[PDB]
Structures are given as structure tokens and as C-alpha cells.
Design a protein around this nucleic acid. Structure first.
Lengths: 125, 121, 59, 112, 204, 36
RNA sequence: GUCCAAGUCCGAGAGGGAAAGAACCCAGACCAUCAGCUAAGGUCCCCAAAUAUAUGCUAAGUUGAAAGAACGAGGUUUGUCU
RNA sequence: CCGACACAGGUAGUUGAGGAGAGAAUCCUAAGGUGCUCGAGAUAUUCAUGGCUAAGGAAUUAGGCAAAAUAGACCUGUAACU
RNA sequence: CACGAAUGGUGUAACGAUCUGGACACUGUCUCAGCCAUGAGCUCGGUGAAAUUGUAGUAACGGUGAAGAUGCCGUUUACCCG
RNA sequence: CCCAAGAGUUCAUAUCGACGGGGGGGUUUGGCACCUCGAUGUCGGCUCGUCACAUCCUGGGGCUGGAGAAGGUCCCAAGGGUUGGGCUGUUCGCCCAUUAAAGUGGUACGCGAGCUGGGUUCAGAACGUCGUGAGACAGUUCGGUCUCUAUCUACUGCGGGCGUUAGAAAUUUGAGUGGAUCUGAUUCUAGUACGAGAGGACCGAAUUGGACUAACCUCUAGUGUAUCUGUUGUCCCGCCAGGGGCACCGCAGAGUAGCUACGUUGGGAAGGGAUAAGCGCUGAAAGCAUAUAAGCGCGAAACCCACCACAAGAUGAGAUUUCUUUUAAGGAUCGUGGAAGAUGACCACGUUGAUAGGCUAUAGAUGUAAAGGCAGUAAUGUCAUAGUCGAGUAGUACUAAUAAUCCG
């Protein structure tokens, strides 16, 4: 019974899961679009939305708070320099997820998790 | 919540310090005995001067429990030690003093003799 | 435990009736005509079309 | 609505603001054999647990050498005129260590 | 003599004479009589009540035509009650007023599902033995399921592990406390099967 | 107080004889159980 | 159950009957036939043939398969004496 | 290398660092070497290895089996018996 | 019934992964089980065995029977496949 | 069960009953050796139950050497219940404390492809005794491997196909099946009836518990590897400050949602029919008598209803309202999620959308963040009820739910 457990362990320990979620965010920040599985992308979305939300105000406290999550100054500076300037005043949902088929080794459903404000060719409708 | 093989502290001047529970009276397969319930105990300390001997079998009532017990009004009482007061062959207390406070639930069960000579209720 | 009787070619054929495969939900886009999985993107020619628009232009 | 039931079917009190660490005295309305009398309980507030109209608070005292703890719902029709003697000066929300701790040194810290 | 409600939550109030009482809020909205089944065309006297209105998009043409012979339109919960108190025709509404202060009701609801549960959590079996005195792998095993060559079969009705789940349960005479009619409240005393925002059948 | 047993006879339609139907009621409610 | 004696059967034996039974009752199978007569046992239906005839008993569903006691009783039919 | 295997086993000797430490114990790291040749979802029953449990504290069981409890340095003190 | 003095008799400080009885502390051993994490298990993609096997479209009851019936007799029950 | 010498103050049958006799059952010890030695695993205990009544309690009566209360005996009755420990491997048995009671038995002395191996029949060693000896004991003591991935049937759950005579969306009747049937204490009746006193009721009416069971998380309590805070060792972010990794979640203090009990609420209530033992009306056979032969009135936790759940594959496949009458009604694939769930299935939504996330607020958890100023020599305290989180709630399309298709 998991009547309310709104968190995906991703078949990993409590430390490995957070390490992977912090390692994927740096990649999604330095390259504005990465290719993952569907569940990992859906978890990365919920992990990275509040960070980009906090990044909309450059304070010495918010910088350290985001650093405590990202654990890399190279991603902290690249999130606070241009990602925050290009997001602007969006209400929410700074990322999009698009399925691109299945893999070959284990037949896993793939996804193309991307930033909304960095893709100028796709709108949705 | 006091059951068989439970050690209690005797709170009166009858001449006992520690006691051991043998039975929880009041029905078949009765599990526990909160404040106000009758139990069968066996004395195990028997202070030197004393009025009771070590190894005797008597009956007692639970006066203080460490388990939080609920009232009808929605309040709770929780003491810090499991205590009991010995009783006569009939429904009467043997002794003339009670140490420490008692529970008010010991008043709805007609234990006026025990409740009328305690420091606090 | 161990089977007491050899499974007949009738009893083992009546059991392999739910062992069939499942045809995927294939759709077609009325932009480039290429077929794809429903609710999935596809690479046509150096690009990625999803819902009539272009997501990636790697040409 | 649950919020409509809560603030309409339970009479709210007017007790002062206290929390963990405070020393208070609660006057309730003990009933007896066809006669009701007020009784006071003076002790340190250990914790305050709840959200609204169902919240309770636990208060502990030492009746001689035996510790006595009591849990009171705040909106009890018997609670009357809660008084406050000391105040706070703690570092927790629930001071549970105060139960397994006695003596002259672990009474309370004063608030400045 | 019958209504449909929705379980809102659970709280605790105090009686007018001291003691605390746990209570459950049932937003028993105004139900509408949909179809009156008589003893001449069907074979028994009863009437259907609809509770929560739907849209014109999710509803079926059959349901639209069925509720067009009535007042309000296709409902989310339609349930048939029997043996009412006042003879009423189609299109009538019953908000909350059928209950009083101090009466008893027989709320019925669908419990919440636990899924596939073992015998220990489903039926109440206890272990096979101790935890360390030689216990190998049967800490939560059922044990035996029958006797030897007589009868050489497992009796029907043997309590085993299966989907515990949630079925329909009645609560057998919960006492009504508040029957506020402006905002449909129906505050009763006791528990109610099912999660929050779940439909319940309150039989008077 | 004290209840009152009211035993009244009736012509049962299942046979045609005179049966007996008693019921414990209030001492002042036996008049409404004998007229029916 | 076991050990002898006088027979029969199974053993080494098909077929019919008792609902199904190696021995109980009838009866000793060279084949083929969409022919007839009978044995044991049966003729309301399952299931071939009598809801056949004449006389009396049973009220217990006794009984319609096999198999029961010491001891009770104002159940009933019938013969003699009295 | 020896074990049928690209096998959780066995295989003499030399060098074998830092912080805290008596220590080659123990925890984290140097130089160096690896991620152990099937993965992805989901987070039933159940098993294996682990964590925490209100009140009681051996009432369990053939049996305190297994767990828990004491554990370091420096001082005070330490019985019958021999 | 049926110990007994170098196939040694009687005691004995220290010792024992020895056997037996009792006490304190401690605890899920138990009253009485409850919650959580990973591996296995469950679903999907790849590779892919073995023990076992007279043929099988493989029910229950009462009975019979080489004396304890899925396969025989009578009755009852049961849509086909996982 | 039959006869009844007696015993019972006298009186065989209130109660017991010798000397003798007639049967039922197959739970003990036996008799036989009929299936199994190309294996039917044996005692005790645990879990799970199920059946018979030859009934321990609760239920209804007859007699009494039954004044009342407590008794004795017999009859009807199987719905539910029928405790925990000390000793012993024990079954059994004795004892301790309760209870309304602590039933007798069967199912391979139920159940080892369900568990343990404490006892017994493996190999080691020792004692008593027998034998010259190797060795043995219905003599005792210490130690000593319990194998297997479920094919068929039997159960507990969940699905797909087809059929119900054109097809769908809903609501239901009920041929039936399953579940629960427990009971104590106190008060009034009433210290009344009865009894010389002591003692002490029938019937009826209320209050409150024990065990069992179902639901739920408002309260209490547990967990809560989401979350918050304190702290230890070492490494890393170039350094200070501040953080992160690992050390059982490093340890320690709390903890929302969820799941649970140790918590809360409810239930076994009431009312019918035919009855068993048994109690009566009228009345003959048999001018009397007789509860029976005709006909009637009562009579139990047993049976059929009744309470709850399921139920038209009930092939005997039911009924009603509405819609469409063949690519129509409608269903499905796929996607966003769940209070649903192993997988199927179920439920809400799919742009004429609030289904999930984000964002804006908040219930709430933790406990006063970072940077700076002030006080001291410093550790530290204060400005500073703030920071972080928010599994819940509400509002907003910012992100994802296509512009396909299939069956009909």
C-alpha cells in the first residue's frame, strides 16, 4: 500500500537517487536538452522546477540554497547567469517532456526533456 | 496496561514495597488492567517490620499506570509508575494510608475508602 | 514438485492462446506522411516532428 | 464544509498564548456527587499538538516524588482562566526530555 | 427515508453535557427523484435518486433522454431507494430535511482497497511459530490447508490470501448530531467507510 | 415504574380458532392494545 | 482366521441377474446374420416386457437389497377351548 | 595457477602512506586500481539482509537459541575460597 | 534391585566455544503484531535449462473393490481459456 | 437396557444397587496377516481448521428424601463459546490463579512437497548389569545434515472469448450461496413471596463491562530511508565563512500525508412460521377414564424467514427507462493521474481542459536561516517568531493529456 507516496525511488538508494538527480540537473543546465528515460525525466522535472523558480532572484542566500542541491559551481553560475535571464517572468513549467520512442538494449521508453525558453521552433499548438 | 508477570509498586503502609501480578480478574482471557481494575498479586519485598509476609497471595487494585488513560470528557491521565493498593478478603482496603496521588477513575468504582485518604486525586 | 504426466500438444496449445503479441498503436502525420507511434515524436529527415511542428532541426 | 463546522459548532476560548517550556496553572471544573468545584493544576507545558478546535496541550507536575502528566484539549467546556507564571526559553517544539529528567538543575531556563 | 451524500472529513465536537464525541461530515446535497418504479409495470414500489449533476459532454444520449423526462439532468450517482415516508412524484427534491436531531442512520459506503493481502493482514492468522526458535521461512505462512487422505481435498471456504479490497459496508445505526439545512451538513457520530470525497448512501 | 402484560384474543385467519397475543406495555397503555 | 475330510467353482472361464463384487443364482464363448424359443431374474419411469387378473394382510413408507436381542404394549386379521 | 566454468573457495615472500589512534584494529582519504558482461518499469503476497517500536519485561521455548545490554583512557575501590 | 578403593575411592584453588539449576540488567522471545529501505519476487525487452513424463477432453458425496477411487455404480455439481 | 436381594428412619426403582442376563460403538490393549519393504516418513508441540453428540456453559422441561436459595437425577437441544502459567520431550497427570464453562472424541492416534527435532532406531563417549571375549540392554546421561523451481485436480482472488435470438447507457427483482449467532456484574421489583430464624427468590425493567469482529484516523500511541534541526571523524567545493559525500538513515531530537493498534465508532437488536422434550381444551374407540384417533392452544440459543455481503453463465441466461435501428448509439487503442491496482481490470480527465506537475497563497512540520551591526579577551548571546519544507487545500492553462486509428 502506497496511498499517497508521491515520490519515485527509481530503484536506487536514498543517496544514489539524490546523486543522480543532482547529476542530471547539471547536464540539463549546461545543455538545454537531454535524452533520458520517461520515469527519470518525470522525476528530474519535479526536482528541477523549484530550483529554476528560486533562480529568479539572485541573492547570496538563494545561491547557496541552489548550490546545496546542484553541488557544482559550474551549474550554479550557468543557472544564475543566463537561464534566469532567458526564463523571464514565466508563471511556471519551465521544462517540457517529449517521448521519442524506445531504446534497443532493454526496450525502455525514452524522452527528450528540454527547457521551454531555449526552444524557438516548437510551440505545441 | 498491566498483565500477568508484571511488577508493580505497592502504595500504602501495609508493609510491602514491590509486588508481582498473577491474574487480571474480570473475565476470560482479559488482557490488561488499567486504573480501577482488580488483580491478584503476590508480595515479593515484605519490609522488615511489616504486616504482610513475602510469598503471600492477595488481591489489589491498580491505582497509577504509566499508560495514558482517556476519560469521557476527552482528557488523559498518565502517571510515572505502576502502583497498586492491597485489598481485604471483602471489598475493603487493608491499611490506613496511601502514598502519592491516585486516579479519579478510582472514584466511580465505589473505592471511597481508598480515595478519601490520599494526598491528591 | 514434478509433473506426473507429459503435457499433451493439445493442453499446451490451448494454453498458448494468450501468449500472442500486441500490435503497436501506429499513427500517421498529415504533414510529412511518415508513420510513427501515437503520442511519440519521430525523425523524418534530420528533424523531429511531433504535432505538425518541428522540435529539433539537425539538418 | 469541515472548516464551516469547526468554527461554528465548537465554542472558542480566550486563553493567552503559550507553548513548550511555559509554566501555567489550569483551573477546571471537576464534577462530583451532585456538586461541581474548580480545581487547579500547576505545571510546565511539555507540548502543544494539533491544528484547530481539536488541539491539545500536555502539562506535567511533580506531586511529591511521583510525576503526573495531563493532556487537555484547549476547547474544553471545563477549562477556565488559564494563568501563566513563567515563559518559554527553550530550543525545541516538544520538550520530551523533561519527562525523564528530575532534580534541582533541570527545572526551567528563564526568558530574557 | 434515504439520501445520497459525500464524505467530507472527520472531526470531534463536545456534547451539551460534557463528553467529547467524534463526528463525520456528510455533504448530503439535494437529491432529485429521477424515476418512480411502481408495482404495475415493474413489480415493486421504489424510486431512484440522483445526486451530482454531470456535463453535456461526458453524458450519454440515453442518459440525457432518461433525465429529460425529469427535472435536473444526468447525474453522477443514481441509486434506488425504497419504502419512503411521503408519496412524491417525479422531479421532486430532497435536500437534507428527511433527518432529525437524535435519529439513527445506516450509512453505507465502499471501503478503500488494500490490494492483494496475505492471510495475516486479511484474516488474522498468527505466524507459524516463534521468530528465532528454529523458524526458517514461515513467519507469515498459513500453515496447513486440510487433513490427510480423508477428505483428500481442500474444503470450500478455506480462508486464504486474496485481494482484500473495499466492498460495500453498512455502519448500523450511527446517531445524527447536526442536520443544518442551509449548507447540507448532516453531522453524524461515528466512522464511515471509504476515503474522503466518496459517495455514501444514508438510509434512515 | 412497572409494566403491564396485556393478553388479548383474536380470530386467526390461519385456522379460525382463538389465539393469544400478549405484550409487556405501560400500565396506562393497555387500553390501546385491547381495542385493536 | 487357522488345520483336516466330502463336493463345486475361480485358478485356467467369456455371457445374463443381484446398481457396481475373481467364488453368490443361471449358464461352458468355431465364426457371420437388423431371426425365433427359453434358464436365473423381472414386466410404473430411468431400462426390454402386466399401471394384468382372483383372494386376504400392512398404516409402519414397515417394505420395495442383506441383517438383529433379552424385555414391554388395550395395533390389527384369524382358529380352537373357554 | 589448482577447483569440468571468465566458479563468492585455496595460493609462499617482499613494499605497503596521511588525519585520530598503542596498533598493520577502526572511519574517511593519498599514489594506484576498479563500478564486479543482462537492463528498464512498478513499489502486491512472500522470502533474504537491515532499522525503529507505546505498556509489560522471558509470561515464548526442550533450552534467554537469536537479538539487546557492558565495552576506550585515567582514578577510587574490590569478597568467600586458595 | 545392581557404588567402592591405581578397568582407582573421596575432595579440591585456577581453568573449560563442557553439562545442569537459580538471580540482576537488558531487550519484539512473547502478549501482538505494526511501519520503513535494498536484493529476490511481479510486468516488459534479450538469452535460455533441469528433475519428471503409458495415452488422457484429468469434479464431489455414499458405496463396491487387492479391504483408503479423477477414471467403477447411483445421485449432485460444473459455460470455453488463462 | 432387563430381573430386583438390599442400602435408603419405615419405602426395591428421589439416589445407589450385589448375584446374573441382552445388546450398541469401534476412540485402548489384543486376535488375523488381507494392500504397500524397485520406501504409505514414526511421538510431542505450533498454524489452520472441519465433523459427531455419547452436552462443560448458555437455552426449554419431568421427578425429588424439591419450604426459598443452593442441589441430585433424567429428557430435548450442536448456534456460539470452551483461560493463562510451574514441573516433565511428553500424551497423560499433579499443582497455582481465574472463568458461565475450562467437554468427550474422529479426520493415516488430522495436518513434516506447512514448520521445530525436544523424545525415539545412525555412526563418538561414560555409568549399572550380562557375557572369558568381540558385544548387548523397552536401563540411564552429553553431543549429533529433516532434500524438491507445483504438471493435473482441490482452494483463495483477478481477467479475456462467446452466449442470453438487433445493439447499447444505467437502475434493479431474486433461484440461491456465504458471514455474525457469545456472556458477566450491579440496580428496581423486594429484603417482598417462602422460612421459627438464618437465609432469600420466579416473572419483568434498566445501567455498565469481558472476548470476537468490521470500518476509520478526530484523540492517544508506533513507524514514517518525504522534511527540519544539533553534533563527531575525514575528504571535496582554490582559501575564511557557508555547504556537500561516506561512516547502520553516521548518531541523536522531532515529524505532515499514508499504514497500523495500544485508539475511536458500530454489531451480535427486535419480530414472525413450523416444531423437539414437555404442558393443556373438547372427545370416543372402550357408557368410565384418557392432551389424540378427528379437530384445536402454548412450547428452545436447534430449522425456515428476519440482519449484512454477493448473486440472471439462474443456458430456466429475468424486468424497467432512454437512445440508436449496420461501418448509428456506443466501446476501445493511446496519453495525464489515482483515494484503484502484482499484470489485466476499476475510476476521473484528454484543449468547448482544472486530470497531474509547476506558480501564487495557506492548514501544517521543524525551530529563529544566511549576510551585517552591537556586547566580551574569547567561546557565545541579541537586532531576528525568522529561514527550509509543505505527500494536504484553493485559484490560475505556464508544461504534458494530437490534428491517428480500430470494433460496432
Amino acid at each position: 500500500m502506497r496511498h499517497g507516496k508521491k515520490i519515485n525511488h527509481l530503484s536506487r538508494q536514498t543517496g544514489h537517487r539524490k546523486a543522480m538527480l543532482a547529476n542530471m540537473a547539471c547536464s540539463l543546465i549546461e545543455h538545454k536538452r537531454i535524452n533520458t528515460t520517461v520515469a527519470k525525466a518525470k522525476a528530474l522535472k519535479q526536482f528541477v522546477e523549484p530550483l529554476i523558480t528560486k533562480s529568479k532572484e539572485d541573492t547570496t542566500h538563494n545561491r547557496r540554497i541552489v548550490f546545496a542541491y546542484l553541488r557544482s559551481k559550474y551549474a550554479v553560475t550557468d543557472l544564475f547567469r543566463d537561464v534566469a535571464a532567458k526564463v523571464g517572468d514565466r508563471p511556471g513549467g519551465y521544462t517540457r517532456i517529449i517521448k521519442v520512442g524506445n531504446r534497443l538494449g532493454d526496450n525502455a521508453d525514452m524522452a527528450m526533456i528540454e527547457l521551454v525558453d531555449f526552444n524557438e521552433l516548437y510551440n505545441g499548438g | 496496561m498491566v498483565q500477568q508477570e508484571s511488577r508493580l509498586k505497592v502504595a500504602d503502609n501495609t508493609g510491602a514495597k514491590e509486588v508481582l501480578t498473577i491474574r487480571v480478574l474480570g473475565g476470560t482471557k482479559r488482557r490488561y488492567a488499567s486504573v480501577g481494575d482488580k488483580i491478584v498479586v503476590s508480595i515479593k519485598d515484605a519490609t522488615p517490620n511489616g504486616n504482610v509476609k513475602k510469598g503471600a497471595v492477595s488481591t489489589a487494585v491498580v491505582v497509577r499506570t504509566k499508560k495514558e488513560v482517556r476519560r469521557a470528557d476527552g482528557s488523559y491521565i498518565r502517571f510515572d509508575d505502576n502502583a497498586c493498593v492491597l485489598l481485604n478478603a471483602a471489598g475493603e482496603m487493608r491499611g490506613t494510608r496511601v502514598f502519592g496521588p491516585v486516579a479519579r477513575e478510582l472514584r466511580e468504582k465505589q473505592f471511597m475508602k481508598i480515595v478519601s485518604l490520599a494526598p491528591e486525586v | 514438485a514434478h509433473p506426473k504426466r507429459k503435457t499433451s500438444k493439445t493442453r499446451r496449445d490451448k494454453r498458448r492462446t494468450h501468449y500472442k503479441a500486441t500490435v503497436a498503436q501506429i499513427a500517421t502525420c498529415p504533414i510529412t506522411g511518415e508513420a510513427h507511434l501515437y503520442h511519440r515524436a519521430y525523425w523524418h529527415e534530420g528533424k523531429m516532428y511531433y504535432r505538425g511542428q518541428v522540435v529539433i532541426d539537425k539538418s | 464544509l469541515l472548516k464551516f463546522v469547526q468554527n461554528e459548532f465548537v465554542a472558542k476560548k480566550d486563553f493567552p498564548d503559550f507553548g513548550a517550556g511555559d509554566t501555567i496553572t489550569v483551573f477546571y471544573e471537576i464534577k462530583e456527587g451532585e456538586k461541581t468545584r474548580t480545581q487547579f493544576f500547576k505545571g510546565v507545558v511539555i507540548q502543544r499538538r494539533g491544528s484547530g478546535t481539536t488541539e491539545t496541550f500536555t502539562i506535567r507536575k511533580m506531586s511529591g516524588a511521583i510525576g503526573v502528566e495531563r493532556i487537555f484539549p484547549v476547547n474544553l467546556p471545563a477549562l477556565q482562566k488559564i494563568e501563566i507564571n513563567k515563559k518559554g526559553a527553550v530550543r525545541r517544539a516538544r520538550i520530551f526530555y523533561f519527562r525523564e529528567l528530575t532534580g534541582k538543575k533541570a527545572k526551567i531556563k528563564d526568558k530574557l | 427515508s434515504g439520501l445520497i451524500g459525500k464524505k467530507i472529513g472527520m472531526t470531534s465536537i463536545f456534547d451539551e453535557n460534557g463528553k467529547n464525541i467524534p463526528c463525520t461530515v456528510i455533504e448530503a446535497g439535494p437529491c432529485v427523484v429521477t424515476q418512480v418504479r411502481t408495482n404495475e409495470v415493474d413489480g415493486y414500489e421504489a424510486l431512484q435518486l440522483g445526486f451530482d449533476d454531470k456535463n453535456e459532454k461526458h453524458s450519454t444520449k440515453a442518459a440525457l433522454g432518461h433525465f429529460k423526462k425529469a427535472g435536473t439532468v444526468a447525474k453522477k450517482k443514481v441509486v434506488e431507494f425504497q419504502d419512503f415516508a411521503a408519496a412524491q412524484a417525479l422531479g421532486d427534491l430532497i435536500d437534507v430535511s428527511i433527518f432529525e436531531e437524535g435519529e439513527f442512520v445506516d450509512v453505507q459506503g465502499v471501503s478503500k482497497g488494500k490490494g492483494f493481502q496475505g492471510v495475516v493482514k486479511r484474516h488474522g492468522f498468527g505466524g507459524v511459530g516463534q521468530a528465532t526458535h528454529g523458524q526458517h521461512q514461515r513467519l507469515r505462512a498459513p500453515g496447513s490447508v486440510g487433513a490427510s487422505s480423508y477428505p483428500s481435498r481442500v474444503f470450500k471456504g478455506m480462508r486464504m490470501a486474496g485481494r482484500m479490497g473495499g466492498d460495500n459496508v453498512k455502519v448500523q445505526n450511527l446517531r445524527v448530531l447536526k442536520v443544518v439545512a442551509e449548507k447540507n451538513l448532516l453531522v453524524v457520530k461515528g466512522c464511515i467507510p471509504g476515503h474522503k470525497n466518496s459517495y455514501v448512501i444514508i438510509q434512515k | 415504574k412497572r409494566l403491564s402484560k396485556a393478553i388479548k384474543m383474536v380470530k386467526s385467519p390461519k385456522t379460525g380458532a382463538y389465539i393469544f397475543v400478549e405484550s409487556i406495555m405501560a400500565p396506562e397503555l393497555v387500553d390501546e392494545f385491547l381495542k385493536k
